[PDB]
């Protein structure tokens, strides 16, 4: 009957929205764990035309810093789209940030370079992420970055050139500037602290780097964050430009 229920054993709900869910499953035949995203779809609609288009791009990605795709299929039970991805054992970049990544200088710079390699690859293949945030970046068991989706305010990652009249591959690099700051800064457990500190970074005049973010031990980071967070997209580097720096 259901391909999902026949082939997989549900282990844990990783994510829940009113309009979608991510489940950790184990495939019965190969004994592997996967993350299976389930999304309700309308096949006689433009929403499904758009979803199928995204599934087409995703199925063509092949890089060590991109969450490995396995399958996608539809079940008529109401139509559901299932996307079977790799299961990343060490959860998301949000979890790393909140557990004090900033103190770990060698790891911090390795993870930023891995997000960069993933990003450069996606741009070289003419694609844009459009939702780059730490919850959408996963870490595997060997502590490697895998860029993913985790999609079920958060507009603090959205580039300024996303308005009526003002957006290419440089949208991802603005979001990257917010992420690298969060990665290079101490955890901001409280919402009010997060919305304040990060809105001060998106200021058109200058990205306000907090008082406890000094040019003593954060000079190399401050340069990269200020360059990526530049209001004028053309003034931002490319991912390869930041890699060959
Ligand atoms: C239960 C735990 N939860 C946490 O750690 C929470 C997370 C939120 C913040 C608080 N901490 C948790 C959650 C996920 C994973 N691993 C994992 N791996 C790969 C994934 C791939 C997709 C994907 C990619 C592309 N297209 C579609 C789906 C979605 C989710 C994935 N999740 C491991 C542990």
mmCIF file with all atom_site columns, N, CA, C and O in Angstrom, residues 45-63:
data_model
loop_
_atom_site.group_PDB
_atom_site.id
_atom_site.type_symbol
_atom_site.label_atom_id
_atom_site.label_alt_id
_atom_site.label_comp_id
_atom_site.label_asym_id
_atom_site.label_entity_id
_atom_site.label_seq_id
_atom_site.pdbx_PDB_ins_code
_atom_site.Cartn_x
_atom_site.Cartn_y
_atom_site.Cartn_z
_atom_site.occupancy
_atom_site.B_iso_or_equiv
_atom_site.pdbx_formal_charge
_atom_site.auth_seq_id
_atom_site.auth_comp_id
_atom_site.auth_asym_id
_atom_site.auth_atom_id
_atom_site.pdbx_PDB_model_num
ATOM 1  N N  . UNK A 1 45 ? -1.787 22.117 -9.769  1.00 0.00 ? 45 UNK A N  1
ATOM 2  C CA . UNK A 1 45 ? -1.498 23.480 -9.294  1.00 0.00 ? 45 UNK A CA 1
ATOM 3  C C  . UNK A 1 45 ? -0.090 23.940 -9.646  1.00 0.00 ? 45 UNK A C  1
ATOM 4  O O  . UNK A 1 45 ? 0.774  23.116 -9.960  1.00 0.00 ? 45 UNK A O  1
ATOM 5  N N  . UNK A 1 46 ? 0.137  25.264 -9.561  1.00 0.00 ? 46 UNK A N  1
ATOM 6  C CA . UNK A 1 46 ? 1.431  25.897 -9.824  1.00 0.00 ? 46 UNK A CA 1
ATOM 7  C C  . UNK A 1 46 ? 2.393  25.641 -8.662  1.00 0.00 ? 46 UNK A C  1
ATOM 8  O O  . UNK A 1 46 ? 3.610  25.677 -8.870  1.00 0.00 ? 46 UNK A O  1
ATOM 9  N N  . UNK A 1 47 ? 1.847  25.381 -7.440  1.00 0.00 ? 47 UNK A N  1
ATOM 10 C CA . UNK A 1 47 ? 2.626  25.068 -6.231  1.00 0.00 ? 47 UNK A CA 1
ATOM 11 C C  . UNK A 1 47 ? 3.399  23.776 -6.484  1.00 0.00 ? 47 UNK A C  1
ATOM 12 O O  . UNK A 1 47 ? 4.615  23.762 -6.282  1.00 0.00 ? 47 UNK A O  1
ATOM 13 N N  . UNK A 1 48 ? 2.713  22.733 -7.037  1.00 0.00 ? 48 UNK A N  1
ATOM 14 C CA . UNK A 1 48 ? 3.349  21.472 -7.413  1.00 0.00 ? 48 UNK A CA 1
ATOM 15 C C  . UNK A 1 48 ? 4.260  21.630 -8.633  1.00 0.00 ? 48 UNK A C  1
ATOM 16 O O  . UNK A 1 48 ? 5.208  20.861 -8.778  1.00 0.00 ? 48 UNK A O  1
ATOM 17 N N  . UNK A 1 49 ? 4.011  22.629 -9.488  1.00 0.00 ? 49 UNK A N  1
ATOM 18 C CA . UNK A 1 49 ? 4.902  22.849 -10.626 1.00 0.00 ? 49 UNK A CA 1
ATOM 19 C C  . UNK A 1 49 ? 6.248  23.337 -10.075 1.00 0.00 ? 49 UNK A C  1
ATOM 20 O O  . UNK A 1 49 ? 7.300  22.819 -10.470 1.00 0.00 ? 49 UNK A O  1
ATOM 21 N N  . UNK A 1 50 ? 6.180  24.277 -9.092  1.00 0.00 ? 50 UNK A N  1
ATOM 22 C CA . UNK A 1 50 ? 7.308  24.881 -8.369  1.00 0.00 ? 50 UNK A CA 1
ATOM 23 C C  . UNK A 1 50 ? 8.053  23.837 -7.518  1.00 0.00 ? 50 UNK A C  1
ATOM 24 O O  . UNK A 1 50 ? 9.286  23.805 -7.571  1.00 0.00 ? 50 UNK A O  1
ATOM 25 N N  . UNK A 1 51 ? 7.308  22.982 -6.745  1.00 0.00 ? 51 UNK A N  1
ATOM 26 C CA . UNK A 1 51 ? 7.902  21.938 -5.893  1.00 0.00 ? 51 UNK A CA 1
ATOM 27 C C  . UNK A 1 51 ? 8.693  20.944 -6.750  1.00 0.00 ? 51 UNK A C  1
ATOM 28 O O  . UNK A 1 51 ? 9.846  20.672 -6.425  1.00 0.00 ? 51 UNK A O  1
ATOM 29 N N  . UNK A 1 52 ? 8.109  20.464 -7.870  1.00 0.00 ? 52 UNK A N  1
ATOM 30 C CA . UNK A 1 52 ? 8.769  19.532 -8.791  1.00 0.00 ? 52 UNK A CA 1
ATOM 31 C C  . UNK A 1 52 ? 10.029 20.135 -9.392  1.00 0.00 ? 52 UNK A C  1
ATOM 32 O O  . UNK A 1 52 ? 10.993 19.409 -9.624  1.00 0.00 ? 52 UNK A O  1
ATOM 33 N N  . UNK A 1 53 ? 10.021 21.449 -9.617  1.00 0.00 ? 53 UNK A N  1
ATOM 34 C CA . UNK A 1 53 ? 11.171 22.174 -10.138 1.00 0.00 ? 53 UNK A CA 1
ATOM 35 C C  . UNK A 1 53 ? 12.317 22.171 -9.152  1.00 0.00 ? 53 UNK A C  1
ATOM 36 O O  . UNK A 1 53 ? 13.463 21.971 -9.541  1.00 0.00 ? 53 UNK A O  1
ATOM 37 N N  . UNK A 1 54 ? 12.012 22.378 -7.860  1.00 0.00 ? 54 UNK A N  1
ATOM 38 C CA . UNK A 1 54 ? 12.987 22.369 -6.766  1.00 0.00 ? 54 UNK A CA 1
ATOM 39 C C  . UNK A 1 54 ? 13.581 20.938 -6.566  1.00 0.00 ? 54 UNK A C  1
ATOM 40 O O  . UNK A 1 54 ? 14.787 20.791 -6.361  1.00 0.00 ? 54 UNK A O  1
ATOM 41 N N  . UNK A 1 55 ? 12.729 19.906 -6.664  1.00 0.00 ? 55 UNK A N  1
ATOM 42 C CA . UNK A 1 55 ? 13.086 18.480 -6.588  1.00 0.00 ? 55 UNK A CA 1
ATOM 43 C C  . UNK A 1 55 ? 14.059 18.101 -7.728  1.00 0.00 ? 55 UNK A C  1
ATOM 44 O O  . UNK A 1 55 ? 14.942 17.275 -7.526  1.00 0.00 ? 55 UNK A O  1
ATOM 45 N N  . UNK A 1 56 ? 13.888 18.728 -8.906  1.00 0.00 ? 56 UNK A N  1
ATOM 46 C CA . UNK A 1 56 ? 14.718 18.555 -10.101 1.00 0.00 ? 56 UNK A CA 1
ATOM 47 C C  . UNK A 1 56 ? 16.141 19.103 -9.874  1.00 0.00 ? 56 UNK A C  1
ATOM 48 O O  . UNK A 1 56 ? 17.121 18.448 -10.235 1.00 0.00 ? 56 UNK A O  1
ATOM 49 N N  . UNK A 1 57 ? 16.247 20.289 -9.274  1.00 0.00 ? 57 UNK A N  1
ATOM 50 C CA . UNK A 1 57 ? 17.533 20.938 -8.996  1.00 0.00 ? 57 UNK A CA 1
ATOM 51 C C  . UNK A 1 57 ? 18.331 20.151 -7.950  1.00 0.00 ? 57 UNK A C  1
ATOM 52 O O  . UNK A 1 57 ? 19.514 19.861 -8.178  1.00 0.00 ? 57 UNK A O  1
ATOM 53 N N  . UNK A 1 58 ? 17.652 19.790 -6.820  1.00 0.00 ? 58 UNK A N  1
ATOM 54 C CA . UNK A 1 58 ? 18.118 19.032 -5.657  1.00 0.00 ? 58 UNK A CA 1
ATOM 55 C C  . UNK A 1 58 ? 18.712 17.686 -6.087  1.00 0.00 ? 58 UNK A C  1
ATOM 56 O O  . UNK A 1 58 ? 19.795 17.329 -5.655  1.00 0.00 ? 58 UNK A O  1
ATOM 57 N N  . UNK A 1 59 ? 18.008 16.967 -6.959  1.00 0.00 ? 59 UNK A N  1
ATOM 58 C CA . UNK A 1 59 ? 18.408 15.671 -7.490  1.00 0.00 ? 59 UNK A CA 1
ATOM 59 C C  . UNK A 1 59 ? 19.681 15.729 -8.327  1.00 0.00 ? 59 UNK A C  1
ATOM 60 O O  . UNK A 1 59 ? 20.273 14.686 -8.606  1.00 0.00 ? 59 UNK A O  1
ATOM 61 N N  . UNK A 1 60 ? 20.122 16.943 -8.700  1.00 0.00 ? 60 UNK A N  1
ATOM 62 C CA . UNK A 1 60 ? 21.331 17.167 -9.500  1.00 0.00 ? 60 UNK A CA 1
ATOM 63 C C  . UNK A 1 60 ? 22.521 17.648 -8.692  1.00 0.00 ? 60 UNK A C  1
ATOM 64 O O  . UNK A 1 60 ? 23.607 17.801 -9.248  1.00 0.00 ? 60 UNK A O  1
ATOM 65 N N  . UNK A 1 61 ? 22.339 17.890 -7.388  1.00 0.00 ? 61 UNK A N  1
ATOM 66 C CA . UNK A 1 61 ? 23.457 18.305 -6.532  1.00 0.00 ? 61 UNK A CA 1
ATOM 67 C C  . UNK A 1 61 ? 24.300 17.063 -6.167  1.00 0.00 ? 61 UNK A C  1
ATOM 68 O O  . UNK A 1 61 ? 23.760 15.978 -6.013  1.00 0.00 ? 61 UNK A O  1
ATOM 69 N N  . UNK A 1 62 ? 25.615 17.210 -6.108  1.00 0.00 ? 62 UNK A N  1
ATOM 70 C CA . UNK A 1 62 ? 26.547 16.128 -5.783  1.00 0.00 ? 62 UNK A CA 1
ATOM 71 C C  . UNK A 1 62 ? 27.833 16.805 -5.284  1.00 0.00 ? 62 UNK A C  1
ATOM 72 O O  . UNK A 1 62 ? 28.662 17.243 -6.093  1.00 0.00 ? 62 UNK A O  1
ATOM 73 N N  . UNK A 1 63 ? 27.940 16.975 -3.957  1.00 0.00 ? 63 UNK A N  1
ATOM 74 C CA . UNK A 1 63 ? 29.058 17.630 -3.269  1.00 0.00 ? 63 UNK A CA 1
ATOM 75 C C  . UNK A 1 63 ? 29.102 17.152 -1.809  1.00 0.00 ? 63 UNK A C  1
ATOM 76 O O  . UNK A 1 63 ? 28.049 16.985 -1.207  1.00 0.00 ? 63 UNK A O  1
#
